[PDB]
Structure formats: structure tokens, C-alpha cells
Amino acid sequence: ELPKLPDDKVLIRSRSNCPKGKVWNGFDCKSPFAFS
């Protein structure tokens, strides 16, 4: 997938995915706990 918007599929921290129940940011797909 081109648009990083997963959670319960691959959630590859690599550089093109967002973990379970998370939220992207200027340059990172992850939970708000690490951004909010």
C-alpha cells in the first residue's frame, strides 16, 4: 500500500506503516502517546 494507514495487518515500523490504533505525524505513523 502506498498510503500508510494500517494497524492490524503488517504495522511495519520499517518506514511505511502505522501500528495498532495509532496516528501519523509530520513524518511518523504511530500512536499519539509518542507525539501528543
Curated annotation (Swiss-Prot):
Disulfide bond entries: C18-C29
Domain of life, per lineage: Eukaryota
Protein name, entry field: Scarabaecin, major form
Native source organism of the sequence: Oryctes rhinoceros
Gene expressing this chain: scar
